[PDB]
Amino acid sequence: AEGYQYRALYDYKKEREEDIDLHLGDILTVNKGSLVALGFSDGQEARPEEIGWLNGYNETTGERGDFPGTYVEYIGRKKISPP
């Protein structure tokens, strides 16, 4: 399984409770399935600003939730592996 990774370029304080805080440098991983379900074919994952809101796992803080695509940069794919 593989996810798409993004890095936070700006700080963000959650508005809604399903949002997550972003801190400069935080690494986020979004499961491909969630993007596929939104019809995000082609390669829009490399343009999160264009996507709008993403839902993922903040690798740096351990929190899961929604975060704005205009606040991050796509850094590439990551293969998820079992523990």
Read out DSSP for the chain?
A: -EEEEEEE-S-B--SSTTB--B-TT-EEEEEHHHHHTTT--TTGGG-HHHH-EEEEEETTTTEEEEEEGGGEEEEEEEE----
CA 82 to chain centroid, in Å, comes to 20
Where residue 35 falls (left for φ over 0; alpha for ψ -120 to 50; beta otherwise) is alpha
What are the residue ranges spanned by the domains of the chain? 1-83
Locus of tokens 């801190």: 23
Q: How far apart are CA 1 and CA 13, in angstroms?
A: 30
Q: Which positions ≥6 away from 50 have C-beta within 8 Å?
A: 44, 69
- Answer whether CATH 2.30.30.40 is correct for domain 1-83: yes
Amino acid at 35: L
Contact present, 30 and 55 (Cβ < 8 Å): yes
